[PDB]
């Protein structure tokens with residue numbers, strides 16, 4: 124009787140890797156979004172005091188908590204055959220995840236800052252590590268033995284990459300227009316390979 | 329197969345790779361790149377960033393691996409250091425993520441002049457650094473064994489000692505008389521892995 128609740132603040136922040144892995148596996152869950160106003164009260168109730176967190180309540184009401192977003196995503200993906208099928212494919216899944224998180228860390232430099240400072244940071248990273256990391260990512264994608272990030276079937280790597288690329292276009296929606304063909308291609312391929320994720324992304328949009 | 333670890337810093341991102349190979353008893357060769365040789369060597373490394381591992385078989389065929397903790401998790405998976413069940417694998421990844429969030433505060437201080445370094449240090453040590461050390465202490469208390477996850481070495485334990493060495497590099501006294509679970513962890517891990525204790529003692 125397991126119920127999976129995803130507890131988070133932002134609609135497209137660190138929980139997206141967790142929601143997209145459950146969406147691609149066909150696993151239902153409930154979203155519980157915490158407002159800035161309720162964070163003082165709910166904080167002491169989440170183990171570790173940070174979101175996102177996942178609360179799993181079985182049919183006897185016993186609760187299991189999981190925290191640390193991509194540790195939760197990798198556990199769910201491992202359980203649903205989305206962490207590669209060989210130790211080599213697992214290396215390659217991890218390699219792309221680590222490349223996408225280095226890109227996400229540049230994005231995070233822009234968050235929760237006033238307008239003026241945000242724009243200053245944006246101009247610095249987009250002239251900086253952002254394109255360098257999109258080019259590394261394109262070369263990773265080129266090296267796959269299949270049409271997705273690793274082989275031809277969905278992995279956690281594909282889902283962390285579409286989350287991170289949505290963050291880059293959040294900073295400049297034109298940044299990737301007419302460039303980085305492998306990333307565009309990746310996204311078309313993944314939405315063709317995963318009708319659930321395409322429904323999720325289209326519904327969400 | 330010959331394994332070469334290619335890197336710049338003696339206690340930077342390649343430490344997770346070295347310690348995993350050490351704990352497993354797998355030999356490798358260190359190739360440290362100087363600031364002066366980096367222009368010429370950069371175009372030869374796939375991705376253009378270190379650390380990188382170059383594996384040459386006895387036919388001299390080369391396989392390259394990049395992305396430090398993607399290399400460490402592949403080697404740890406190969407040597408039964410990524411947990412024995414899917415639950416232990418989650419707990420190994422939980423602590424790694426906690427440790428990397430501490431490492432990211434440490435990285436805010438690097439390759440900065442003295443005065444900016446000092447100012448950044450003062451902000452993180454009064455900030456997310458203790459918050460994260462308490463989170464890690466609570467993780468450590470939840471282990472079903474004496475190490476970070478269960479009772480046998482995992483990658484989690486090696487990433488945590490590398491990150492704790494980074495904190496003490498910023499303030500050698502920061503953990504004196506505090507955070508007992510982390511002191512304890514280090515004593516336990518060095519007692520569980522003579523290779524790593526030999527490696528760390530030699531290194532220091």
Ligand SMILES: N[C@@H](CCC(=O)N[C@@H](CS)C(=O)NCC(=O)O)C(=O)O
Pocket residue numbers: 136137166172173174175190191192193425426429
């Ligand atoms: N590495 C952690 C980071 C968790 C984290 O930084 N959470 C922030 C926002 S995403 C938070 O909970 N802030 C509120 C607080 O610390 O009180 C993960 O990926 O889950």
Ligand SMILES: N[C@@H](CCC(=O)N[C@@H](CS)C(=O)NCC(=O)O)C(=O)O
Pocket residue numbers: 221222225341370376377378379394395396397
């Ligand atoms: N997440 C990557 C980070 C690699 C990285 O940032 N390397 C930096 C030094 S820490 C580098 O090689 N800089 C040299 C360059 O970019 O030319 C890893 O962990 O391996």
